[PDB]
């Protein structure tokens, strides 16, 4: 999708 | 659901 | 501050002078710091050497770098 | 972005209204284009040349 959308849809701790 | 279960048991 | 005094005339008829002896008149719809503009119901007059040609347009965007003067008619 | 144009042949119109044909190889943010096998849209200017983004008015994909 995108480089920023990859970091946006990330599971945190 | 929970009400009847808590009443009959 | 000069850019705010232009907010002052939003939805108000404006007179604009551009490089190359062209003049537009229309209703101010938007502008930025670059003085990019969107006008509606605007007429352009080009002055070529002397005759003057006209051009009508319901809605036009204008690149700010061509802009010289922005006043009212 | 000019990304879809890489390695493909292109038509180039400079601001002064001149026209070139060539293979778009490189390009940066300032629209500096790297070109190969250029020609006056039919004289061969060069095999490789670099052009300033200032001079570019328009690029077309052919």
């Amino acid at each position: 999708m995108t480089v920023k959308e990859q970091q946006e849809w990330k599971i945190p701790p | 659901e929970f009400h009847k279960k808590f009443m009959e048991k | 501050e000069p850019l705010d005094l232009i907010r002052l005339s939003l939805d108000e008829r404006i007179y604009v002078k551009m490089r190359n002896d062209r003049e537009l008149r229309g209703r101010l719809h938007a502008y930025d710091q670059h003085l990019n503009m969107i006008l509606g119901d605007v007429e352009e007059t080009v002055t070529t050497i002397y005759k003057s040609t006209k051009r009508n347009i319901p809605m036009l965007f204008v690149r700010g770098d061509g802009v010289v003067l922005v006043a009212p008619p | 972005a000019l990304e879809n144009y890489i390695n493909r042949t292109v038509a180039v119109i400079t601001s002064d209204g001149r026209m070139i044909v060539g293979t778009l190889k490189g390009f940066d943010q300032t629209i500096n284009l790297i070109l190969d096998e250029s020609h006056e849209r039919e004289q061969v200017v060069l095999g490789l040349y670099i052009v300033r983004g200032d001079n570019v008015a328009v690029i077309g994909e052919i």
Binding site: - | - | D11, I57 | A1, G17, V56, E61, I62
Partner: protein
């Protein structure tokens, strides 16, 4: 930053673009960037004389710095949205 958002709201719309060098090109706005560079699909000739030396090519990238005018119809644009957003800027 404002006019970028504006042009993003104009994708897949037919527009006529006039460049400084008296070149006029109709087409479909496919892409817009920060410099207000435009990419048009389905190039066409609005005027007989001004129109440059093309034919087969259907897609162009236009340098933002070279455009004078972008022609729009009143239907393509919400005026009130524009006015309050223009007011919004600093």
């Amino acid at each position: 930053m404002l006019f970028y958002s504006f042009f993003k709201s104009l994708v897949g719309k037919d527009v006529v673009v006039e460049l400084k060098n008296d070149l006029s090109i109709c087409g479909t706005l496919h892409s817009v960037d920060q410099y207000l560079n435009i990419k048009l699909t389905d190039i066409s000739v609005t005027d007989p004389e001004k129109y440059p030396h093309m034919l087969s090519v259907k897609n162009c990238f236009i340098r933002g710095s070279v455009v004078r005018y972008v022609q729009l119809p009143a239907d393509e644009v919400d005026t009130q949205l524009l006015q309050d957003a223009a007011r919004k800027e600093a």
